[PDB]
């Protein structure tokens, strides 16, 4: 029931965007994909597209997990935003580029009261025109629950390693 996708498909979607919000997560750290991620941002920004990063306070497995890796890949601080200052921008976003995140985006956090992630504020990636999830399989995140967004109409799954996918996505672009 999931609308799967490939590197070529994903590269059209972002190149024809006025605005793209990158949502990094644990899987991005596991793949060590931040260099190739910021690479993709340089190509997007060169076309005239607006690029930002949405950092959930508990993305990854430690505080500042996404920050240190983004800083290593040399992404400037002015492009990186915390949940509370970027959540409203997802309405104006053509695409939410979710790279290795999952629990952080899951809407069951405010829908399902019996969910383990209920009450945790999330990034509202569903408000974007389209959502792109990069992850290897249909496996859950840390919390061990499924994400409704996976089988949403406006979502596209990019099944593979986050570094390899992003690297390949950069190739389809120019």
């Amino acid at each position: 029931s999931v609308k799967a996708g490939s590197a070529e498909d994903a590269a059209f979607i972002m190149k024809n965007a006025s605005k793209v919000i990158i949502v990094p997560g644990y899987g991005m750290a596991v793949a060590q994909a931040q260099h190739a991620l910021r690479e993709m941002a340089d190509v997007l920004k060169k076309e005239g597209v607006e690029v930002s990063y949405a950092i959930h306070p508990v993305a990854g497995r430690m505080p500042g997990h996404m920050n240190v890796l983004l800083a290593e890949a040399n992404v400037p601080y002015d492009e990186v935003f915390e949940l509370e200052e970027i959540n409203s921008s997802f309405q104006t976003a053509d695409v939410a580029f979710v790279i290795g995140a999952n629990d952080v985006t899951n809407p069951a956090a405010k829908t399902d009261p019996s969910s383990p992630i209920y009450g945790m504020p999330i990034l509202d990636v569903e408000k974007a025109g389209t959502v792109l999830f990069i992850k290897r399989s249909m496996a859950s995140g840390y919390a061990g629950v499924e994400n409704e967004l996976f089988f949403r109409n406006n979502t596209m799954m990019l099944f593979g390693d986050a570094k390899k996918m992003t690297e390949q996505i950069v190739q389809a672009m120019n």
Binding site: R61, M62, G64, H65, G119, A143
Partner: protein, 359 residues
């Protein structure tokens, strides 16, 4: 409804359970925020900074706490047995929120119960996603992991990064992190960004992937994989040990026999020193040198980062308290069905209520 934050009186404690930002949120909720003069100096928070956010400055601890319905502080209040009866300063019927150490300090729980004070031990916060914002174990130990690396680099006589120069090349520092929880992960990240080669080990299996997600290498290959640990430890310049188990003594991960095999100029940062240490040669609040190795064992490492630790601690306190403030009638009603309230409440209205402490 008054909330009060006194100065921390325990030796070496420089944190405070307040920040200017959190003062603004508390007054917006309907509180009169009162804080003792000089309470935030260790955390670089002046009295002027607090007053500008809406707080009133009391000149003494007694005056700050006299009329307070809610009391926030970082460490548990001192009892009469410790020579300074801080619980006596807290008003009868009041609510206390702090790092209580309740399960290892029954006497403070008893003493609060005598004054019918409802106390919430923040360290007992339930491990659910909803409560990550209220979790003082995470926020404080994270900064300790960062600090451990800053302290290691300070005590070490070589630079962390590799440097290729006109006069020759000097190699990177080699770091071994024992224990890959919150503190351990931040130590790996701080060590790696400084340019060190970083190894790590831990008993939990999922942690190998976490180490690799920060660019560290996990030590891998009947129980003798201590050989593989030793092989790296002999090459290590800075060993950071973070392994603890609450209510129990810290596990011995670097024996004295192991430190004799380390190279001179090496340093061990024992973050588990308050629970007996991961290295038996470590001593609370001291730097000891044995076998040419500095064994560093500072107490209260979060207080060595007091100025960032205090805003985070106060936010944890605020995130815990906020859901229970109903402005409709300027009061706090702590809902009992809330897991964060039941899991953390130790005593209430003159009786102990936490399962682990009741007679």
């Amino acid at each position: 409804m008054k909330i009060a934050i006194p100065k921390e009186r325990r030796p070496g404690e420089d944190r405070v359970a307040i920040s200017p930002e959190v003062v603004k949120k508390l007054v917006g909720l309907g509180f009169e925020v009162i804080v003792e003069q000089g309470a935030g100096v260790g955390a670089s928070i002046t009295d002027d900074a607090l007053t500008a956010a809406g707080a009133t400055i009391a000149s003494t601890a007694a005056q700050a706490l006299s009329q307070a319905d809610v009391v926030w502080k970082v460490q548990r209040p001192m009892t009469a047995e410790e020579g300074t009866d801080e619980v006596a300063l807290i008003k009868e019927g009041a609510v206390l929120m702090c790092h209580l150490g309740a399960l290892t300090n029954r006497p403070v729980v008893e003493a609060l119960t005598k004054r019918k004070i409802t106390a919430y031990a923040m360290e007992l916060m339930p491990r659910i996603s909803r409560a990550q914002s209220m979790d003082i174990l995470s926020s404080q130990s994270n900064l300790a992991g960062y600090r451990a690396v800053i302290d290691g680099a300070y005590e070490f006589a070589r630079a962390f990064p590799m440097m290729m120069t006109a006069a020759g090349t000097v190699p990177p520092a080699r770091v071994l992190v024992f224990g890959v929880g919150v503190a351990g992960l931040q130590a790996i990240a701080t060590a790696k960004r400084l340019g060190a080669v970083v190894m790590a080990t831990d008993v939990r299996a999922a942690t190998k992937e976490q180490v690799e997600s920060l660019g560290g290498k996990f030590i891998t290959v009947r129980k003798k994989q201590a050989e593989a640990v030793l092989k790296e430890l002999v090459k290590t310049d800075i060993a950071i040990t973070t392994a603890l188990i609450p209510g129990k003594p810290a596990p011995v991960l670097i024996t004295e026999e192991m430190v004799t095999k380390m190279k001179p100029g090496s340093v061990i940062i024992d973050l588990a020193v308050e629970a007996g240490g991961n290295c038996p040669l470590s001593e609370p609040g001291k730097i000891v040198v044995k076998h040419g190795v500095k064994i560093v064992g500072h107490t209260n490492v979060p207080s060595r980062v007091a100025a960032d630790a205090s805003p985070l601690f106060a936010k944890n306190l605020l995130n815990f308290l906020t859901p229970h403030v109903d402005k409709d009638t300027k009061t706090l009603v702590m809902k009992l069905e809330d897991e964060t309230v039941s899991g953390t409440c130790v005593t209430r209205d003159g009786a102990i209520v936490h399962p682990a402490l009741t007679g």
